[PDB]
Amino acid sequence: MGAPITAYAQQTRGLLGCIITSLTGRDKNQVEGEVQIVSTATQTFLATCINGVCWTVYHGAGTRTIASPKGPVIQMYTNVDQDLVGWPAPQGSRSLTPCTCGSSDLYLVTRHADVIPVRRRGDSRGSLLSPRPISYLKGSSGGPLLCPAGHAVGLFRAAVCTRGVAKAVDFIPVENLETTMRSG
Amino acid sequence: VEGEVQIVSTATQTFLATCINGVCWTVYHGAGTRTIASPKGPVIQMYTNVDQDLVGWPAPQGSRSLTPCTCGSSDLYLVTRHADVIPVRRRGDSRGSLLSPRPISYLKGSSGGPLLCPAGHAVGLFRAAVCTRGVAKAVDFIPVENLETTM
Amino acid sequence: KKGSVVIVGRIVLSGKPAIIPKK
Amino acid sequence: KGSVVIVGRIVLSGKPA
Ligand SMILES: *[C@](O)(C(N)=O)[C@H](CC1CC1)NC(=O)[C@@H]1[C@@H]2[C@H](CN1C(=O)[C@@H](NC(=O)OC(C)(C)C)C(C)(C)C)C2(C)C
Ligand SMILES: [Zn+2]
Ligand SMILES: [Zn+2]
Numbered sequence: 068m069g070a071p072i073t074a075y076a077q078q079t080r081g082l083l084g085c086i087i088t089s090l091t092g093r094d095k096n097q098v099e100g101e102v103q104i105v106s107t108a109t110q111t112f113l114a115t116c117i118n119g120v121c122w123t124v125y126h127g128a129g130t131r132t133i134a135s136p137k138g139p140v141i142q143m144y145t146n147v148d149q150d151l152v153g154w155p156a157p158q159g160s161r162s163l164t165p166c167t168c169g170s171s172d173l174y175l176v177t178r179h180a181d182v183i184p185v186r187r188r189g190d191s192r193g194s195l196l197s198p199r200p201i202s203y204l205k206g207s208s209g210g211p212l213l214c215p216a217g218h219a220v221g222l223f224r225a226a227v228c229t230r231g232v233a234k235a236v237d238f239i240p241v242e243n244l245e246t247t248m249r250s251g
Numbered sequence: 252v253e254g255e256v257q258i259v260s261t262a263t264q265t266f267l268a269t270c271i272n273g274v275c276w277t278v279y280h281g282a283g284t285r286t287i288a289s290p291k292g293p294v295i296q297m298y299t300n301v302d303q304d305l306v307g308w309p310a311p312q313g314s315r316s317l318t319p320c321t322c323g324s325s326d327l328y329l330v331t332r333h334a335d336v337i338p339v340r341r342r343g344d345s346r347g348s349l350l351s352p353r354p355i356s357y358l359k360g361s362s363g364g365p366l367l368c369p370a371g372h373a374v375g376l377f378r379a380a381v382c383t384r385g386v387a388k389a390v391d392f393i394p395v396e397n398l399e400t401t402m
Numbered sequence: 403k404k405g406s407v408v409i410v411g412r413i414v415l416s417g418k419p420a421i422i423p424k425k
Numbered sequence: 426k427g428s429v430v431i432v433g434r435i436v437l438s439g440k441p442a
Contacts, residue, residue: 336419422433
C-alpha cells in the first residue's frame with residue numbers, strides 16, 4: 068500500500084456478465100482490495116474504500132445502488148454538491164485511511180494500477196510531474212490520491228487538460244468525505 | 252503475472268536484473284559481456300557500459316518494465332533477491348544510507364536490483380554495498396538517468 | 403430504477419514484492 | 426554456451442496468479 072506504493076489490477080467480470088449483474092443487482096463474486104473497478108451501463112470508473120465506506124464520484128454512480136451478494140445496496144451517503152456517493156464497503160474489501168501528515172506529494176493510483184506522482188498546488192488540485200494523455204486517466208475517476216504513507220488524500224475527479232494532454236487533476240479532498248457523512 | 256525484476260545466475264555468481272524501458276539491465280561486474288539465455292538461443296547485450304557498470308539485453312519473457320522516477324524523491328526503497336524492501340535515504344545522486352543497517356549477507360546477491368521511489372518507480376540500479384566491518388549501511392547505485400542515457 | 407453499479411475488477415494496494423512461484 | 430540464466434522472477438506489486 069505504501070513504502071513504496073505498488074499496485075496491481077485484476078478483471079473479475081466481462082461485458083455480458085456485468086450487464087446481467089447490473090439488472091439482477093446480485094453479485095456473488097469475491098471482493099478483495101481497496102479500490103474496485105466499478106462500472107455502469109453508461110461508463111466505467113473507480114470506487115475507493117476508506118474507513119469502511121466505498122466512495123466514488125456522483126457524476127458516475129448517480130444515485131444508483133451497488134450490486135452485492137445480498138442484492139442491491141442503497142447509498143449510505145449522497146452529496147451532489149461534493150460529487151460523492153458511498154455504500155458500505157463490499158464484504159471482502161480493504162479500506163484506506165485518511166492522510167494525517169499534510170504531505171503535498173500525492174500519488175494518483177489509476178485504473179491500470181499505475182501510481183503516478185502529483186504535487187499538490189491547491190486544496191483540491193495537484194499537477195502531474197509527468198503529464199499524460201487524458202485517455203490514460205480515463206476511467207480513473209474515483210481512484211485514490213495517496214500521500215507517501217499510502218493514505219487517502221482525496222479522490223480523482225477531473226483532468227486539467229489542454230490539447231488532449233493532462234497537466235493537473237482536480238480532486239475531492241478526504242475532508243469532503245467527513246463533511247458529506249456529517250451532511251447526508 | 253510478469254516479473255519486473257529477474258533473479259539471474261552465472262556459472263560463478265547470482266545477482267538480479269531489472270527491466271526498465273524494454274531493456275533488462277544489470278551490473279557488468281556480474282554479467283560481464285555475457286549473453287542471456289532464451290528458448291531460441293543466447294541473446295546479446297544491446298548495451299554494455301563498462302564505465303558505469305551497466306549492461307542491458309532486450310527484456311526477456313515474463314517480464315514487466317518499471318517506470319523511471321520523475322518525482323525525484325530522496326526516500327528510496329531497495330528490493331533484494333529475497334524480495335525484501337530496504338528503505339534508503341538518498342544522500343547523493345548515486346548513494347544512499349540504509350535507514351537501518353544490515354549485515355552484508357542480507358544485501359548479498361541483490362546487485363542489479365531496483366532502487367524505488369515512494370511511487371515504486373525506478374530511481375536507480377543497485378550497484379554495490381558500502382559496508383563497515385561487514386555491515387552494509389549504505390549502497391552505490393546506477394541512476395536511471397544513466398540507463399536512459401545509454402539508450 | 404436504473405442499473406446497479408457492478409464491480410468489474412479490483413486494484414490491490416496491500417501487495418508487496420514477491421518471487422513469482424515456479425508453476 | 427556461457428550465458429546468463431534467469432532463475433527466478435520478482436513481481437514488485439505482489440500480484441498472485
Ligand atoms: C471520470 O469521471 C471517469 N469517468 O474516469 C473522468 C476522468 C477524466 C480524465 C477523463 N472525469 C471527468 O470526466 C470529469 C467529469 C466532468 C468533466 N471531467 C473531466 O475530467 C474534464 N475536465 C474538467 O472538467 O476539468 C476541470 C478542470 C474541472 C474544468 C475532461 C478531462 C473530461 C475535459 C466532471 C468534472 C463532472
Ligand atoms: Zn499522510
Ligand atoms: Zn517517483
